[model samples]
Target chain A: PAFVNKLWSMVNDKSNEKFIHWSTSGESIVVPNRERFVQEVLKKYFKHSNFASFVRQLNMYGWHKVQDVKSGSMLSNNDSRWEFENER
Target chain B: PAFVNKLWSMVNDKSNEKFIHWSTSGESIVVPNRERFVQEVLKKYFKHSNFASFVRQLNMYGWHKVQDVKSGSMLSNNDSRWEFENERHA
Candidate 1:
């Protein structure tokens, strides 16, 4: 629950173009650059860059992954996308 | 971390003989009644009595289990013992 609260803050932060941010609908998060997110966001805030583990934690807490239709195809971490959401 | 904080409060609470509580030395915890702890304490505080999941969370946060030599032999969660500790001498 602490991590979830911290995560909400991290997503709402507006200081930079974070690797993760709220989508236009304000219903989900979009990770445009997974690698940068791991090195800059996750490690910076949670002390570790294991994105997989981060996702696992989110899953345990009721987050769900959604399709990134705009990406068209699952390309590299840069142009592709990683999206997840929780109930509003 | 929230769970750990909640757990610390539960252990230190003196209002009643909680299923878990601080030992005389205040360096560890003693669970004298596992079944009661699961039903009354764990579920009452944490919303679930999945003792296994609770212990897993503690382990993830670096808790350690120590042998309860005073209990002598492992009994049926009654006269036996269950103990764990953190670095804060909790």
Candidate 2:
């Protein structure tokens, strides 16, 4: 399920322009949400609070850092990566 | 040049995540701010207030729609597109 969530995360991140693309080929579709995937499938499912350990937990998914963001690189399919990305 | 501005816009738009990539293989640096771009260039340079027409004015950059940003697409290199995107962020 974690890996499946990672697949969904690849597509769900709004900034990802190509990978697992979201098309407008039909009626308004309900695509996956980044926050939802992170909260529900990842966080809720894991019952994990610490991010690094959680990342360690999902080694297959690995870290996908979003560099610069403006002209940035992709970083999704892993909540642990985004946790630091969205760090306040 | 407008095209250069357009290039800047492409990289400047935070949601792109690819295309003209902003690499972090170095010391920390400053990246373009989409708002500053709008307020400074597209809006202030042309002395234009309205967006759609401003886009019309540029014409060369063309239109790149962001689609649905919650599960969206790239629409920068053109400020009019971002006017709609930042209207709602992911």
Candidate 3:
């Protein structure tokens, strides 16, 4: 509960709006720039910038990684980045 | 998050008050009876009977297994079963 609540706050925070934030629909979260976002936001919040571990935790808690539609692939670098949404 | 919340609710549930419950101080959770509690409670909720996996998840989320003072050892079967408390992260 604490981890998810803290993650929600971090994603919703205005300070981190540019790097990582919720989609306009509020159904998912977007990380436009993974490198910078992990180095900055993830490191700050989780004490370690291990993106895979973070994603693993998300998966354990029932969050799914959304494939990038525009890039027509999964895990594209820049514009087509990462999006995570809850199973429910 | 969901896991921890569900675990908390399960530990505090009135029906499970005897099998698994919070310590009087509410600082930790105790499972007085291990085999029965795991077979009933853990299996019912987690869909698997792997107590070690459950403990691994708890450890991953910053929970620590407390040593049983009465049993004078780490893990005991009946009387000194299991007690887990949130780490400093909590």
Q: Which stretches of candidate 1 lie over 4 Å from their true place?
A: A1-88, B68-80, B87-90
Residue B1 local lDDT, model 3: 70
Predicted candidate 1 versus true structure: per-residue lDDT over A1-88, tens digit per residue: 7888878678756542458865533345767777788888888788844888988888888887775454346553434467777642
Please identify model 2 stretches exceeding 4 Å from their true place. A1-88, B1-38, B58-60, B71-90
- Compare candidates 2 and 3 on lDDT and give the better one: 3
Task: Order the candidate numbers by lDDT, best to worst.
Answer: 3, 1, 2
Q: What is the TM-score of candidate 1? A: 0.42
TM-score of each: 0.42, 0.21, 0.43
DockQ, prediction 2: 0.01
Residues A1-88 of candidate 3: C-alpha lDDT, one tens digit per residue: 8778877678756678767866533456778888888888889988854888888888988888886454446634455378887787
lDDT of 2 by residue, A3-88 (tens): 55754464444444222223322111122344544455446434654344554544444433233223336543543223211121
B1-90, model 2: which lDDT tens digit per residue? 654465456556765442223445422112244455455544433342333333332333443333423433654354222422222222
Q: Residue A46's C-alpha lDDT in candidate 3?
A: 88
Q: Highest lDDT: which candidate?
A: 3
